[PDB]
Amino acid sequence: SDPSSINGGIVVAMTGKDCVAIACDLRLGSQSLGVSNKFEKIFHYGHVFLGITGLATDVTTLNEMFRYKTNLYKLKEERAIEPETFTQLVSSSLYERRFGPYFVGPVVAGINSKSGKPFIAGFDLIGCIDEAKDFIVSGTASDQLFGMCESLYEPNLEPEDLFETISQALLNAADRDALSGWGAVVYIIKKDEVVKRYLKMRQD
Amino acid sequence: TTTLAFRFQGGIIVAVDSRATAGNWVASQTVKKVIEINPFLLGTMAGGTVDCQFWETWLGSQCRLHELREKERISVAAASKILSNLVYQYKGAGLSMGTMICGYTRKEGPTIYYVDSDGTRLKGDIFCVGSGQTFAYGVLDSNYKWDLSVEDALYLGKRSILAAAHRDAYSGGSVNLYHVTEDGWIYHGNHDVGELFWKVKEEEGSFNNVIG
Amino acid sequence: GSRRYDSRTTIFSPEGRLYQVEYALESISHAGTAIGIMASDGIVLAAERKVTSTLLEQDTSTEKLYKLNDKIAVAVAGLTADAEILINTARIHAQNYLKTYNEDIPVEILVRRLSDIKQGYTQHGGLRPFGVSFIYAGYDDRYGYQLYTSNPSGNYTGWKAISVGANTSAAQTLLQMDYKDDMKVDDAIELALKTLSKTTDSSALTYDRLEFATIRKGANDGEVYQKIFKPQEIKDILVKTGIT
Amino acid sequence: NNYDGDTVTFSPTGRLFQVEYALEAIKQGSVTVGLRSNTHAVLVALKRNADELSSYQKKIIKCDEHMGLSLAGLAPDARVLSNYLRQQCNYSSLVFNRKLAVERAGHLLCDKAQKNTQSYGGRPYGVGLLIIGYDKSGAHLLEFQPSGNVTELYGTAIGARSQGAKTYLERTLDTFIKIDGNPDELIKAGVEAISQSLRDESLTVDNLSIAIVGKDTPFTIYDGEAVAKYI
Amino acid sequence: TQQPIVTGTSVISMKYDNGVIIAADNLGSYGSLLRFNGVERLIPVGDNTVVGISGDISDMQHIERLLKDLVTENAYDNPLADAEEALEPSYIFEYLATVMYQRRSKMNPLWNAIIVAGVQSNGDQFLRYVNLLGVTYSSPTLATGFGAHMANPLLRKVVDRESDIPKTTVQVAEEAIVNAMRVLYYRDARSSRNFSLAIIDKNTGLTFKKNLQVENMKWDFAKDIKGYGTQKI
Amino acid sequence: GYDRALSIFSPDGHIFQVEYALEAVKRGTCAVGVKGKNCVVLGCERRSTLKLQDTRITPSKVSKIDSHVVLSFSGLNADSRILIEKARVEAQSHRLTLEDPVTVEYLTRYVAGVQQRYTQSGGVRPFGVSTLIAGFDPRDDEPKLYQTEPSGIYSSWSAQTIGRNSKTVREFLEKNYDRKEPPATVEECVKLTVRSLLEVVQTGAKNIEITVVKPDSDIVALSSEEINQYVTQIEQEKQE
Amino acid sequence: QFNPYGDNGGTILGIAGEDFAVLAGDTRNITDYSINSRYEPKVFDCGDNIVMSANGFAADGDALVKRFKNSVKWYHFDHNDKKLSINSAARNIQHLLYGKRFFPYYVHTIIAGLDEDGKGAVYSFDPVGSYEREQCRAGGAAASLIMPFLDNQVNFKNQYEPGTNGKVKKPLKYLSVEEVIKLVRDSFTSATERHIQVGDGLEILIVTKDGVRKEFYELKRD
Amino acid sequence: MDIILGIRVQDSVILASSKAVTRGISVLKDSDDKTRQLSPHTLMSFAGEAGDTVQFAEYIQANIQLYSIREDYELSPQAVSSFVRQELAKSIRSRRPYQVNVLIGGYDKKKNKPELYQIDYLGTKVELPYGAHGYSGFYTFSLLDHHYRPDMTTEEGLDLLKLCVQELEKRMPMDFKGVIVKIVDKDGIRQVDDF
Amino acid sequence: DRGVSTFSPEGRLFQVEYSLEAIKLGSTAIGIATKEGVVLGVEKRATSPLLESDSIEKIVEIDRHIGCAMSGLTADARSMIEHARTAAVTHNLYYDEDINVESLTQSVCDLALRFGELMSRPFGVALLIAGHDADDGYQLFHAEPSGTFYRYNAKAIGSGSEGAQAELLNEWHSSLTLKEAELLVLKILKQVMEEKLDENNAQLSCITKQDGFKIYDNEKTAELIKELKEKEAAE
Ligand SMILES: [Mg+2]
């Protein structure tokens, strides 16, 4: 019934020293029924990464939409969109459906190509921006992710340390949520290289 | 209501009852539940209302316009789909309809299409629609063969309506028979259930439960 | 009433021609020459900017060669402003198709769409046609490398090598003479620049009076790269081919 | 000349040529006569045929039980205006349970015809109408021109050679106005009036068309052998 | 769809030999609050018609303006506006009836019960009813709201059928009406003592009586009534 | 919106815009249609003023409306695309509602209806296009060939040509086509179609396109070499 | 909440003879337990030898009758004063009713007259336009009290010929206009006794080739 | 309607779809084919609310057939599935949404690979080795999880499908009157007439 | 230029008068009304021998009791026929009866003047509408683009109209049989046609109360042509 918790899933993003990390589980379900273990919730438009939790048809629709918009942005601007600008675009796009919204919990992550500054942001379904320094959480296990991140996180982590933190935050949160899990992916993002790691986790 | 229609060697038999009720009150015993769309097409009326009357006489207007433009008899497939596409536009509004569009053309042969106010459109060999459909289905299924004679097929349809008219409280009055051939439908009379019941009981030896 | 002042843009002449289309084509004949040449391993787009100034900021300037998506580019001949209206429409169609089918739009489908828009302005609406001719250079996995052209009438055709704008008669003869089917991109680059060098109304062909682009499979493995040449890069290729 | 290309253009002398050309179409049309007394009102119309095989074009149209008109000019325009009258007569009856006054019916026709003369794109109506009726203030006869000018009269005529019938009625004014409670004699005066506009041809059985409305007489049209009595 | 706010109660009326009488009290209630004591609910149209209106007062004021506008419109291009082509009761009613039914059919009714009383051109008595549903009916006696339940029974003892109309004089008819208004004051918890009465006669014309009061009331017997059963003191 | 009446009558009772649309057809490349006993063939001219063309991708002159019907044309190319698109949509719409593909006559009647509508609609000019619509009705082995034109009139033909120098090739067909015995085979029909184009075309190289349509959705376009063999055989017989 | 419908009571009765037709209806108009009018005409002459009554919610009934009468008028204008046949009128009424299929005229409509062969005809309509030609039809409040009586006394249902004992039915002999009017009056007298909404007066309209005639009869006023 | 299954094997896609059509209390038909051929190498099975199912299926069919004629080219199964998803995603926020779930089984002639897509009425697309809609997955997925291999032959796929249907016939309350099975491969679409 | 709905100084609509000139250029169509039926006949006028003449449809059915023949810009008639067929069928749906021939004709003629700056120009086609109803019996109407329609006992429209009408003037009487009318149409068509009349370049049709509207077979018409030749050679 509740659109945001039919399909389930989670996304978490963190900042580190000269790097950001974004991670998601792979589950798509129809309430109790597990349907797919390959439903990735993180997408990217150039060097800007977008995680999207919530209703899966909208996750897909919004990805396709932001691809559409960032492609036209690039053709006209003659440059790739930045995380700060994209965040505003996401907020704009969500609020234009103020009285008929996409049931989603987007999360932006990326490094500004010019300043080199790590950036993360989160939104509610209606477009309100949550720009946190430390971390952003989203999905059916957001309470669990808040609890994990709040205790596990410490500022200025190196990329390979940040990976361990965000991975353990996601995994242990998803294991306390019936509608999350079935695999997980973690992106480690630096100014000019990105490493994508699939995690081994319990498949129930 | 009880309406049936079935394909066989000799074409199509259409049989209907005649009762119309508003709650427990019997409003009419002389209702025509077979629409004569045109001389080659028939439609049944189950569903509760004017909806079948209104929209199937309208269907006759569309079939006439078709053969004026195309200089060719409309197919049973096309005719039934004109109706199903129409009621599908009205889906949700509250139309109440359950009909068999029956016809016999060159390219198709004898054809029956069940059309529904939910938008359902099914081709088939035997259909039964109404509050007394289950009773009619019992007699049909146990006695149906493709190689029935026009005489026996007509009787089977009549007897199947009678079976429903007896048990189903909201069916009865009288039985209307039709026989659809390639050269058009042929009316086979109005049969009062009251008289038909005793006639059938005696001649057939059935309804031994009932005292006559 | 208003009828008195109506030019009636969408009518036939007694001969069966569309006045405005014919006059729009006359307009395009005064525009800078644009050339497209299709090779086996890529496409070349070469185009001449019209009598420029020394104070014109060339590196940020774009009047001839535009990008529709990652696979398809166009060369413009005519009113730049009119072209940009159509270009934005084309860019949107490519994205709509991508959103719908989750596949990059085939070149011909995009070309047909734009050409159909142009056609509409010649048949209805009472507005003047777009005074623009395009050369479409593109690639898809069905037909591979493709060259097209469309004009204000809305008619489009396919080409191995083609010119639009000024001196197309002279340009098309020179291309027809030196073009071959087994030709390569580096050879086509040379032909394109040699053709413009001979057909130009200027005294000499220099880097500041040119826009240049190549669509190559010369991208790392099975994929396609668009290269819009920079002023310094156009200057280099002019020396390499031995024109300056 | 230069000012007759459309209805929206005044001439230098202040004329509307398109309206005057529409007025001309009435003069080309067949003659029709209107006249009334204090009890009854009568329409007499000379119908026109295309040839000997053809029928005679109907000239009289009923608008209500107590109102109707005769036409002269473009028949399709008379059909449009008569239909409009039928609706207004009907609106009055349905909404107000009230028979539409003949004077008010004229006001409506005037205003409808006017809008066609002031706007670009449209054209004036190419027909003249003679509306007769019996309402709460007795018998009435109106003359409608497509310029917009509607005029209440005792008697009149419009169409080709209508001047002859109009002069006759002007002489007979004091006689026919007094024909009260006698429909046949009032029609006779109308048939005698329209006869002044005839040349070469005479009033035959399928040529003549007569309509009447009065105190205890609904608007009824007479054609064929019904008018043989008056020939 | 709305709910009535400021309301007017019963309108009562009856035919007599030469015309019609209509009456209605001068109260504008606000629920149980007897808010407005100076509200005229009989609205004369010309010299031959009086429209009595009960129910929502804001909608009454709207209808009042429609009628005022109707008179203006009727005078336009009408030399006989004060003679043969003057507004009839039957015209005024049919107009209102059309509006009432149209409004109910748009699910946005004028929350009223209206009685049009008048005398026609030919001297005929006109008395017809219409309400928020657009339901219309005519009768020798007509009454709205509580009047329907209490006034009609009394008025029907005077004119029980059509043949009793010529036998009923204006003095007998007015007496019956005034008595009915007293009965309603006794028994209707949303009525007032002050009322207006209108007589439309084919001979003497329209007589409009304002500031009338219910009088000759019986209350003395109340002193003897004590307790609710067993109490003696 | 633009409401101007472009197509209107003249004092002599002519609609010049419809007649000037026919002049655009006269300018267009020649198209020919010949129906045999069990096939129809659509021949089309390709003007050789345009070389360095890419014949793979260049719009072909014959277009499939459905799997069983084809449409060729003469006149404004851009205009033809609009009629083809509408026809293709109507073909699918007919299948969707009637549960049966369009008859060649019906599809023709539709396209002709569109063309007519543009001759008395405000703010639009007529199509500068005449079409040849050919094919076979569903479950029918009788060949069908129809012609339309800007005015909106349409009719059936045993054989017909439209476009530039169509007067000449119609002259040829009128003497060479026998109604009592039409081209019995595919070869005979194609041969007669190529022969008729060779009266006008110039060179029989890449200037002739041939498309053969047979019953039960059997449509195929002939290649250069296949057509070139017909061109060779025709002229070798002619040298006598 | 605003309820756009109401129930004005009343009862109507149509009977088709061999060369005539009658459409009767009581003249009482009511709401709840109150009488609005003891004489409010319900059956109307609509012209062209057709009589009509739309029983139920009086506002919708009056609207429908008004619109049908209007339809007769425009039929004459549009089709050269052609007489509207009873079967054509019936079909026209179906469309008037079905036009408001999703906000119905809350009435049970009956019309009566003569068919094109001069025989008696009665047509019966439900609120949304389903209709049928019938020999006999009571409508409205006391319809359930009248129809069974008519099945028995007009169509001779359940009646058999004495001596045969259920073997031979009573023959369906034709009823005269005087015989029908007796059954109409006894139906309404009986209905008045047992139904509170029926009474005051009975108005019958009789349709023949000669035209429409009216007959009024008193009913009990309690 | 009720049960629709799908399984992608080595060189083909197999779609099973029930034959029963129940309207209320009676089974009106026991031979209903709940599928439409969108293109020569693409098949779509469907289940959902009455009327909407066929109306949608035929609408998609017409659009793909229109594309096939216009371009003289068959769209890839992926492209068709993306088109279908978008229509359903558009549908869900309409005045009256299509209540239709579909499986799109196709063979991509370019990649020489079978492909099975599962799309629900919300527009939720997933590419799968095997899929189902409604309560079908609850019974069958445990068997498919156990037995499925990506390199299965078409004959092995059918045997695994029979085991699924048997489990449905055993444990489901509703009688779905068996299934019509169809195979989609490089040679096109064909029906297994004995099952 | 000038308005489409402009009046000339004589009081005529330019466009309507010009559309009448287009009708004069059209092929001949003839109608003859009798008490046994109404006969409609047309000149097909194929522009080439390769044009399959049976596909030339200038006679058309509107309903079972109403037929129609056309002359002029025949493409314009398709929408008029569509409206007529819809009007006939619609009226039957509303009133459970056949529609009067005059009422049908009036409905068609209402379209005529719906042009301006609605359609952009008048129709360039005239119609001979023939039919039967119970009120006025057998009827023949001539519907123009002016919006006016005349009833006729007999009427010819098209290029040979005034010549044919003069012939119909002499030949028509109120006691014609159907067979006499059939030959009379064939006689007058043959007179005004450029090419020699046969069963392939001319078409006959009729409307009777019993059988309704029927287009004649080329075999049936051929016999009537042969019957005509013999009776003209007979004196
Ligand atoms: Mg689990």
Ligand SMILES: [Mg+2]
């Ligand atoms: Mg029963």
